[PDB]
Design an enzyme around this catalytic site. Structure first.
Site: not given
Lengths: 106, 106
Positions: A34, A37
């Site tokens: 991700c 992230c």
């Protein structure tokens, strides 16, 4: 200490007890694929060093989907803040300003 | 176009380039033996038609285990969403409503 070296929660017993043990806590719920992230990683390292009174831990939502579910985690990253042995709130998303503000309020 | 004619990803670099090039991306991670993936095919065809500004691709997790592994996929179907050059979210399972709602938000 840094995003790389902070404790990674791998089970519910550890998750629950480490909350109880800590007066101030940030859990970074993340996924390795991700992008938001990944973006937040160097920001977390800076916050880890700027707030040594705060325990930061991390949790891989694909690896530990039972922990993520316990915190009803939907968006990545989700930072769950703990205060005095207890989870108190969330900061959702790759938002370093809101995240630092919540940390300052602990 | 449809489930049958969308790009079927086969390579990790190709997957990475697609993520960077696309403002809006859906990847259908599926397995051929898995019934819920089959059930989702006509739903994906409808979504592919409804969202011409979204690039839809698919990936067979058993033929491309490294790409599945990169996205931490162990339940199928899993729909991985990308926005503006990075992966942002994952919808797990044969859930047409949740999928569209995620796609709608890209």
């Amino acid at each position: 200490s840094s995003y790389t070296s902070i404790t990674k929660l791998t089970n519910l017993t550890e998750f629950r007890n480490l909350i109880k043990q800590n007066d101030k806590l940030v859990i970074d719920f993340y996924a390795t694929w991700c992008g938001p992230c990944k973006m937040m990683q160097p920001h977390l390292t800076k916050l880890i060093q700027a707030y040594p009174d705060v325990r930061f831990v991390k949790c891989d939502v694909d690896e530990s989907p039972d922990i993520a579910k316990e915190c009803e985690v939907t968006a990545m990253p989700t930072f769950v803040l703990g205060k005095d042995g207890q989870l108190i709130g969330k900061i959702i998303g790759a938002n370093p300003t809101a995240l630092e503000k919540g940390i300052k309020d602990l």
